[PDB]
Amino acid sequence: VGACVLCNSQTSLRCGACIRRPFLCCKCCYDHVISTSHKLVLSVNPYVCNAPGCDVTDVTQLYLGGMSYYCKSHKPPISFPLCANGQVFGLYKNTCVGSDNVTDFNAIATCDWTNAGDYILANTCTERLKLFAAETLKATEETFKLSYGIATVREVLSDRELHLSWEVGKPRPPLNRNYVFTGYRVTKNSKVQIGEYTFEKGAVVYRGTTTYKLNVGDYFVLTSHTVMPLSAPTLVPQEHYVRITGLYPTLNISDEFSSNVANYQKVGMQKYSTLQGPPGTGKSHFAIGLALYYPSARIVYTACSHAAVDALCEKALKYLPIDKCSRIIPAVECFDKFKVNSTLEQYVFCTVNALPETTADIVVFDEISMATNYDLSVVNARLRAKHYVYIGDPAQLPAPRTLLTKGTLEPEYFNSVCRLMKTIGPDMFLGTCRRCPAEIVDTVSALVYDNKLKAHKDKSAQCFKMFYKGVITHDVSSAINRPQIGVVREFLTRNPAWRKAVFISPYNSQNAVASKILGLPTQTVDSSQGSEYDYVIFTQTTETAHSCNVNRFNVAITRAKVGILCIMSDRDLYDKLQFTSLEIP
Numbered sequence: 148v149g150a151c152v153l154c155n156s157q158t159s160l161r162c163g164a165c166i167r168r169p170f171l172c173c174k175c176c177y178d179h180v181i182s183t184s185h186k187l188v189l190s191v192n193p194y195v196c197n198a199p200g201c202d203v204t205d206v207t208q209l210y211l212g213g214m215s216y217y218c219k220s221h222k223p224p225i226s227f228p229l230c231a232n233g234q235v236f237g238l239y240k241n242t243c244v245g246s247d248n249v250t251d252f253n254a255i256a257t258c259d260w261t262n263a264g265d266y267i268l269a270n271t272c273t274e275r276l277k278l279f280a281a282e283t284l285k286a287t288e289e290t291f292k293l294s295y296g297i298a299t300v301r302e303v304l305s306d307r308e309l310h311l312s313w314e315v316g317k318p319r320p321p322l323n324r325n326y327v328f329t330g331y332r333v334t335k336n337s338k339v340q341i342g343e344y345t346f347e348k349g350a351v352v353y354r355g356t357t358t359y360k361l362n363v364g365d366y367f368v369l370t371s372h373t374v375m376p377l378s379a380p381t382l383v384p385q386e387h388y389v390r391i392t393g394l395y396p397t398l399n400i401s402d403e404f405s406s407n408v409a410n411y412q413k414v415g416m417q418k419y420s421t422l423q424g425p426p427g428t429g430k431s432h433f434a435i436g437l438a439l440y441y442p443s444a445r446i447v448y449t450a451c452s453h454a455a456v457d458a459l460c461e462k463a464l465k466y467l468p469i470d471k472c473s474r475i476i477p478a479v480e481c482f483d484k485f486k487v488n489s490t491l492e493q494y495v496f497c498t499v500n501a502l503p504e505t506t507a508d509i510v511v512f513d514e515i516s517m518a519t520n521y522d523l524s525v526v527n528a529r530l531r532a533k534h535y536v537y538i539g540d541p542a543q544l545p546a547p548r549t550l551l552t553k554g555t556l557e558p559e560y561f562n563s564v565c566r567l568m569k570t571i572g573p574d575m576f577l578g579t580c581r582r583c584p585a586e587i588v589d590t591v592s593a594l595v596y597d598n599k600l601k602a603h604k605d606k607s608a609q610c611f612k613m614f615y616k617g618v619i620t621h622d623v624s625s626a627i628n629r630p631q632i633g634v635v636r637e638f639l640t641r642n643p644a645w646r647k648a649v650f651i652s653p654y655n656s657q658n659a660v661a662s663k664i665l666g667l668p669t670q671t672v673d674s675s676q677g678s679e680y681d682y683v684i685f686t687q688t689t690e691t692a693h694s695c696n697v698n699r700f701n702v703a704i705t706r707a708k709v710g711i712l713c714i715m716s717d718r719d720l721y722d723k724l725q726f727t728s729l730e731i732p
């Protein structure tokens with residue numbers, strides 16, 4: 148028994164064909180089963196023919212005779228159908244409303260989540276459907292990883308490199324940091340974990356979360372966890388205030404955080420606020436300075452990845468009393484300079500999926516473009532706070548949609564918070580970039596920020612761009628452009644100062660080849676987010692939809708502090724690059 152996902156009308160009915168099995172009142176349970184392929188219906192018992200040897204599960208072909216359900220061939224003389232009069236039989240038949248259109252709820256439950264339009268509807272629908280779509284999408288993603296085969300150690304060629312044997316019949320998952328395997332050893336009766344691993348083409352290379360003398364017979368599987376149901380909404384009801392509520396500003400603040408005093412008060416005059424922070428604008432500076440401005444405020448700093456949650460710890464280590472902090476870790480290594488697992492410690496730093504159930508004066512959700520509507524609902528479910536601050540940049544990169552292949556996901560569809568920022572604008576906007584040269588800022592400002600991003604540094608005069616298509620070769624699940632890597636090599640022979648540069652590309656296979664031919668550190672654009680390097684050498688590799696993505700190309704050129712070389716394939720972003728042009732040797 149539970150609340151309907153369409154009309155809230157109390158129900159004792161659940162759809163058996165939906166992987167989340169939402170409670171559906173007789174009206175909505177009916178309009179769903181007759182308009183889709185979903186026919187299995189669950190209540191206290193399953194609506195299935197209780198006759199020996201019968202396989203009828205469709206509720207339209209089932210009748211309730213006595214207290215057991217049968218079909219047309221197995222029903223008693225005294226029976227009435229379970230599915231008629233626009234209602235499926237179940238408790239609370241008098242309390243049943245119905246919706247003007249269930250069509251939105253149907254496409255959510257039937258879609259394979261491989262199209263961009265599936266994620267659009269999952270973000271525009273009613274709030275209760277945003278929660279249901281988040282579970283359905285995430286439970287689908289946790290199940291698709293079971294479709295991938297098992298990799299087994301056929302040979303241990305050396306350290307750091309392996310020879311893998313893959314399962315038959317099932318496909319193989321791509322080998323990049325977006326897929327994180329988990330190993331096992333063949334014990335007596337069952338198996339035991341031996342850390343998490345990531346792989347890449349060589350035989351394959353690996354990188355282990357822990358070090359081991361792993362041997363033949365060990366196997367790796369993408370660990371899929373549970374998808375618990377969502378109760379709280381993605382966003383609490385917004386409440387604007389006339390005074391600062393529940394918070395108390397300081398009389399003495401330092402000149403380091405003085406330019407934020409207006410926004411720190413803005414945080415106290417809203418139930419929740421949004422802060423867009425382009426690269427180099429000082430987002431973690433903002434989040435920690437907010438603590439000094441409201442000194443006695445219990446603040447919970449949170450994000451999805453431990454890396455983002457640890458970057459806040461580094462700044463809290465630089466400004467806040469250490470005995471007032473705590474790092475929450477569930478029983479991969481992370482920041483271990485605060486007392487671990489102390490929920491009653493003023494400043495709490497934790498990931499979303501590990502969040503305890505507690506209250507706080509302020510909550511700081513960092514790097515919000517990575518979040519999903521599932522994460523947003525968990526934060527509101529575990530954390531009941533007075534003010535919610537959402538820090539991020541919807542012009543940066545979103546969470547990887549491992550099923551999405553057709554179409555492109557726009558920033559307003561990343562999550563509910565990014566929808567507000569890209570439509571009604573963000574409550575706050577850090578508009579000065581103190582990291583990149585002027586040519587980079589003057590490029591991403593017009594590209595994704597409506598010319599509202601101001602450069603603090605001057606022109607570095609060391610930003611260059613070349614238009615070289617070259618030769619594109621493909622492999623299993625990545626692309627490789629060696630003539631672009633070769634152009635970089637010929638550039639490096641005439642610019643040996645650019646050998647302290649980081650090589651960045653949209654494809655990790657391009658990084659692997661570039662690591663062998665150039666010897667520069669490698670980062671995919673998605674792995675480079677949140678990090679700054681002096682020099683960056685970027686090869687777009689292709690002009691597919693993946694490499695031309697403006698939120699990716701924004702991150703691709705903003706990691707530079709001094710200079711950058713961009714070997715471009717797409718003419719569009721090549722002309723949008725305000726860089727000194729170079730010719731092809």
Ligand SMILES: Cc1ccccc1-n1cc(C(=O)O)nn1
Binds near residue numbers: 432465
């Ligand atoms: C990077 C940045 C951009 C803008 C404003 C402040 C900062 N920042 C200063 C500090 C520090 O003093 O540690 N951290 N971050």
Ligand SMILES: [Zn+2]
Binds near residue numbers: 162185
């Ligand atoms: Zn269904």
Ligand SMILES: [Zn+2]
Binds near residue numbers: 152156172176245
């Ligand atoms: Zn309903």
Ligand SMILES: [Zn+2]
Binds near residue numbers: 196203218
């Ligand atoms: Zn039957």
